[PDB]
Amino acid sequence: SNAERIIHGDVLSPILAYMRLKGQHKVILESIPARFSILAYNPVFEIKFENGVLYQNGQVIDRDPLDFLYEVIHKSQHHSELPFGGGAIGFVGYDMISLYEEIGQIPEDTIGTPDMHFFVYESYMVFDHKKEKIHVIEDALYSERSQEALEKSLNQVLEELRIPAPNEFEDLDLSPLDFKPHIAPHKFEGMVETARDLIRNGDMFQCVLSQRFSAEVTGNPFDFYRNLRVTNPSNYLYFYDFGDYQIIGASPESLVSVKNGIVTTNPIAEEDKALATDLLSDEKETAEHRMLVDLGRNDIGRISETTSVQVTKYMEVELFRYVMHLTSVVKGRLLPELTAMDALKATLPAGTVSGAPKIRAMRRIYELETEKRGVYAGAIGYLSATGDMDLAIAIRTMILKNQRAYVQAGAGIVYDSIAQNEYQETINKAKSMTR
Amino acid sequence: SNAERIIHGDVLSPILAYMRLKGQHKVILESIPARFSILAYNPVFEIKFENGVLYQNGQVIDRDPLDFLYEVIHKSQHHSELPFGGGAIGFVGYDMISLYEEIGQIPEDTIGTPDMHFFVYESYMVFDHKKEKIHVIEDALYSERSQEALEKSLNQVLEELRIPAPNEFEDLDLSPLDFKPHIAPHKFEGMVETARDLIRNGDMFQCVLSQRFSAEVTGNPFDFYRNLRVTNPSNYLYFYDFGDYQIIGASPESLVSVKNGIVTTNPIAEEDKALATDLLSDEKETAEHRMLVDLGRNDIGRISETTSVQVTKYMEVELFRYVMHLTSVVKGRLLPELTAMDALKATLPAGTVSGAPKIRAMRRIYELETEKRGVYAGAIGYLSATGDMDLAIAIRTMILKNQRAYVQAGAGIVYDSIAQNEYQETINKAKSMTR
DSSP states (O other): OEEEEEEETTSOOHHHHHHHOOOSSOEEEEEOOOOEEEEEOSOSEEEEEETTEEEETTEEEOSOHHHHHHHHHOOTTOOOSSSOOSEEEEEEOGGGGGGTSOOOOOOOOSSOOOSEEEEEESEEEEEETTTTEEEEEEEOTTTOOOHHHHHHHHHHHHHHHTSOOTTTTSOOOOOOOOOEESSOHHHHHHHHHHHHHHHHTTSOSEEEEEEEEEEEOOSOHHHHHHHHHHHOOOSOEEEEEOSSEEEEEOOOOEEEEEETTEEEEOOBOOHHHHHHHHHHSOHHHHHHHHHHHHHHHHHHHHTBOGGGOEEEEEEEEEEOSSOEEEEEEEEEEBOTTOOHHHHHHHHOSOGGGSEESHHHHHHHHHHHOOSOOTTTTSEEEEEETTSOEEEEESOSEEEEETTEEEEEEEEEEOTTOOHHHHHHHHHHHHHSTTO | OEEEEEEETTSOOHHHHHHHOOOSSOEEEEEOOOOEEEEEOSOSEEEEEETTEEEETTEEEOSOHHHHHHHHHOOTTOOOSSSOOSEEEEEEOGGGGGGTSOOOOOOOOSSOOOSEEEEEESEEEEEETTTTEEEEEEEOTTTOOOHHHHHHHHHHHHHHHTSOOTTTTSOOOOOOOOOEESSOHHHHHHHHHHHHHHHHTTSOSEEEEEEEEEEEOOSOHHHHHHHHHHHOOOSOEEEEEOSSEEEEEOOOOEEEEEETTEEEEOOBOOHHHHHHHHHHSOHHHHHHHHHHHHHHHHHHHHTBOGGGOEEEEEEEEEEOSSOEEEEEEEEEEBOTTOOHHHHHHHHOSOGGGSEESHHHHHHHHHHHOOSOOTTTTSEEEEEETTSOEEEEESOSEEEEETTEEEEEEEEEEOTTOOHHHHHHHHHHHHHSTTO
8 A cells, every 4th residue: 555765865856856757747846945065076186294205196295294285276366256166175184283293202003094185176066055056167277278178078077977877776885883992991991080180180171082993894985975964964074085095074063264364263162942041051061162262262363463353153052963062153364474274283183172281182192092093183174276275173084994994082081070971972972973 | 277067956966976977086075054845647537627517537527626626635544744645736726716706707718727627646756855865655545556566666666767868967948938918008007096996985905906928938848947946945836747738836825734634824915134124114014914814814713613723923024035024824723524625715815816805806806807817826736635735825826838838916906006016016026937
């Protein structure tokens, strides 16, 4: 009396269904009371920093990695009204900050990602979801390609788009992973204890300690991304294929953005309204948030005209679908001699993945953690050829490499932390992606 | 230095693009901070009322058309948690009310649509856009098909969905139409004058007079729908293919809905907030809205438990993208012996397309208008096998028939109406679809 097939929503629209269906007397009835997606391919350059050496398409470059990246990416005469408009897409690892601060000896790397990896693109698509328009772009920013070459590349992309992938309607290959901890539960609780005691002795105020977990990869990584973007709609979704490793994530927390010379940070730290007014109390949670707002005011203030720093939205309440947070917006006008790289260096890594005071907390983290953080707790996003930039904090991010899947999550240790609670908080956060 | 192709957003998603693109080093970066679409095909029955005769698949039925439609559609033991779940999709023409009220002689029909036309479906898809899941359904409500037959039908639908239509990436064939009026501008102004004088003489309070326009069809009707759903995202979008005619519309105004025994109506009648508080003044516009709320209270009250009628949202302000309106919600508990048909008969046609008092205004409309209204100012939507129902007012609706495209729009004539202003209001409204 009933038969049903469920199709995932990302491979069929009601228009496509109507055009393809061959049945009689077809009718459509709809109720219609997502911002941008960037897809990039065929990069002109790979820019990578690993083992203390800077590479461009395999050639050694004797330059600072961030100064070189900006110099190669930024095109003064280039303008565009799309969010990305060409440029670099990639990440900056947590450990990049060791080039600019003395954080001590970096522990053993059990994953092996480079400290920085960007691809540089002049061939890309931008989905303007609000306008329901797709911009397929071939540009000559980095190659000086002829207009004839742009048109050929564009025609080839369009011909590929007409041809269906053979597996478009197969069900998602979401085999679940068996994640194993990288440290003993009791060893993490001892680390929490050590950090807690330092905080009591006046060494610092807060220290984010993290645990890593990993599993032998099973199933399809891209299908995990397809499911992730339905179950975790964040301001940042990303699937980066670097060839021998992939980065897949749904970070809800921006690290920093630069847009037309403006630097912005977004501090994040009746049953609806119930826990809402409770959250606006709790002098511990508001103090947490205020502390992050003030960190953003100072970070932006160091690189801006000092009287341009504005808190434009303050401790308003934003309710996600697994946890609740207080939200604010801090903005300033970048000084004329500085660039997005200075915005990156001023904020990396976020206070919520390091601690306060940040430098002391970072030294303590690497006296306690036994694995180099790598991608985790760094910055992920793009640097546009316009010099605009948008970077997410690399939390809620999975690394696929060495035939394993790595996830990692931290907890802010304070003076009254309970080690067992923070072990639990850490494994729940790290594995909430895994669903 | 730049080449670009724009693809319409309804034939490609970023997932589909990723799977189909063959370029090197593909990355996706997205920002993701629409309710339902119903597609139905291969109907079991056609139910139609034309020229005073009721037909089911061509056979004459000696029954009242609405009682018969409900009897055929409603299945007591059937339940489903999707909005439609099977049933009838179609329209009820304005002139159907002549079966239940004496509105006088109906003028000449220059279009020739039936007064009622529904297709009855057990094969359909529901796009649950919020969950990003597509439900492809084959049911045995009306046929008693075996489970083997459902599975074969479903497999055939799925095989059709895998095969791209050959024109999926062609640009929209939106040739613009040259619409011609069906009456002289001065004749409409004389009708307005006649109605205005009647209102002054105490005959009635308000009378909606309409103008029709039509053009020789050029271009593709479906591509017009594809563009319409991007430029007019209403609670009601619909493309109905009846074979020798099509109905395409974007009505923003619900006529009436029935859901689990509850009948609902939705009376519709800093630059943001500026014209907002101005709208909450203007004792003429609020009086207009209040009048529609009270019409809904009485309509629902006649078919409900009288102390269950509730105004649950009152004269709150809703801002669309071409005009602004005051909005309210009226609900009641349908009496146990009545059905959605009684809800339809209690509300058809909406006060905003007829007048006050409604019966006198309808008699006057057909003393002044020279063409049968037909689809215009009736009701469009579905009747579910559960007995639930959702009907839009048939405004902002285009009829494609006789190789012409017909649009129509009305204006509420009151005691101080200016005939030239109402002629203008009418042609602007009727043609705002045409874009």
